[PDB]
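Q: For a teaching session next week I want to show students how multiple molecules come together into a single three-dimensional assembly. I've collected the sequence lines for a complex. Could you give me the predicted structure tokens for the whole thing so I can convert them for display?
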Amino acid sequence: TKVFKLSFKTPVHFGKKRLSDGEMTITADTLFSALFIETLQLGKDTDWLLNDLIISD
RNA sequence: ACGAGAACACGUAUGCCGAAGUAUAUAAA
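A: Of course. Below is the structure for the complete assembly, covering every listed component.
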């Protein structure tokens, strides 16, 4: 049960409704979506990291 | 399998214009 720390050094747009909107934190929805899209881009197998991983916001 | 994805804060125009470094100032002894 490890935790990850994120440093950016470049400004980030995270969005709620419109591109001119700004939000500070994002939810496990967008995070899990990103992990899924990068898993598919890598061409790895998705079953393992679909129904076993629990992510906090 | 991210309220996403396309997307040059771009284009036009300058330090310009009138102005004298002048006026007196026995090269005495």
